[PDB]
């Protein structure tokens, strides 16, 4: 609806975005000569994120809501 703005801030994030952001940071540790683009990796992380349970996904859902609520106390109230 309205993410990129000229002066206003941007939208919020989510747990699905932190998954590829945290899974990509743990790739260079064992992938110095490997091209892991977003699709070449987001395709594999989706197979695990879709099978992951609430016991593991909770670690990403708690980090996404922490920033998602911060946007409510920025332009409104």
């Amino acid at each position: 609806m309205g993410k990129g703005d000229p002066n206003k801030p941007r939208g919020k994030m989510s747990s699905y975005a932190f998954f590829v952001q945290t899974s990509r940071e743990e790739h260079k540790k064992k992938h110095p000569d490997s091209s892991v683009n977003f699709a070449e990796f987001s395709k594999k992380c989706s197979e695990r994120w879709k099978t992951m349970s609430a016991k593991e996904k909770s670690k990403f859902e708690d980090m996404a809501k922490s920033d998602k609520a911060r946007y409510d106390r920025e332009m409104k109230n």
Side-chain angles (χ1 to χ4, degrees), residues 20 39 56-57 64 67 69:
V20 178
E56 280 197 85
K57 275 156 76 200
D67 197 289

mmCIF file of all heavy atoms in Angstrom, residues 20 39 56-57 64 67 69:
data_model
loop_
_atom_site.group_PDB
_atom_site.id
_atom_site.type_symbol
_atom_site.label_atom_id
_atom_site.label_comp_id
_atom_site.label_asym_id
_atom_site.label_seq_id
_atom_site.Cartn_x
_atom_site.Cartn_y
_atom_site.Cartn_z
ATOM 1 N N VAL A 20 15.662 -15.332 6.417
ATOM 2 C CA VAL A 20 16.705 -15.261 5.346
ATOM 3 C C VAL A 20 17.857 -14.359 5.804
ATOM 4 O O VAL A 20 18.994 -14.546 5.411
ATOM 5 C CB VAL A 20 15.992 -14.663 4.128
ATOM 6 C CG1 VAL A 20 16.979 -14.503 2.967
ATOM 7 C CG2 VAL A 20 14.854 -15.594 3.700
ATOM 8 N N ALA A 39 17.042 -15.642 -4.272
ATOM 9 C CA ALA A 39 16.190 -16.775 -4.750
ATOM 10 C C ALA A 39 16.923 -18.102 -4.589
ATOM 11 O O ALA A 39 16.339 -19.088 -4.180
ATOM 12 C CB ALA A 39 15.908 -16.483 -6.224
ATOM 13 N N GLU A 56 10.433 -23.197 17.230
ATOM 14 C CA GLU A 56 11.602 -22.564 16.555
ATOM 15 C C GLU A 56 11.176 -21.249 15.899
ATOM 16 O O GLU A 56 11.861 -20.248 15.992
ATOM 17 C CB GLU A 56 12.036 -23.577 15.498
ATOM 18 C CG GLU A 56 12.863 -24.680 16.161
ATOM 19 C CD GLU A 56 13.636 -25.452 15.089
ATOM 20 O OE1 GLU A 56 14.714 -25.009 14.730
ATOM 21 O OE2 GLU A 56 13.137 -26.475 14.650
ATOM 22 N N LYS A 57 10.046 -21.250 15.241
ATOM 23 C CA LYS A 57 9.558 -20.002 14.576
ATOM 24 C C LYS A 57 9.304 -18.906 15.619
ATOM 25 O O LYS A 57 9.306 -17.730 15.303
ATOM 26 C CB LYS A 57 8.249 -20.397 13.888
ATOM 27 C CG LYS A 57 8.555 -21.000 12.516
ATOM 28 C CD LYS A 57 7.406 -21.918 12.092
ATOM 29 C CE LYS A 57 6.220 -21.070 11.624
ATOM 30 N NZ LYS A 57 5.040 -21.971 11.726
ATOM 31 N N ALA A 64 10.215 -10.007 15.133
ATOM 32 C CA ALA A 64 9.458 -9.220 14.112
ATOM 33 C C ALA A 64 8.427 -8.318 14.798
ATOM 34 O O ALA A 64 8.248 -7.173 14.426
ATOM 35 C CB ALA A 64 8.760 -10.263 13.238
ATOM 36 N N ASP A 67 9.779 -4.944 16.388
ATOM 37 C CA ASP A 67 9.945 -3.755 15.500
ATOM 38 C C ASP A 67 8.599 -3.363 14.886
ATOM 39 O O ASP A 67 8.356 -2.208 14.586
ATOM 40 C CB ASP A 67 10.920 -4.206 14.412
ATOM 41 C CG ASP A 67 11.488 -2.980 13.694
ATOM 42 O OD1 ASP A 67 10.745 -2.352 12.959
ATOM 43 O OD2 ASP A 67 12.657 -2.693 13.892
ATOM 44 N N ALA A 69 5.769 -3.223 16.319
ATOM 45 C CA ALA A 69 5.034 -2.348 17.283
ATOM 46 C C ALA A 69 5.724 -0.985 17.391
ATOM 47 O O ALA A 69 5.092 0.019 17.664
ATOM 48 C CB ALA A 69 5.096 -3.086 18.621
#
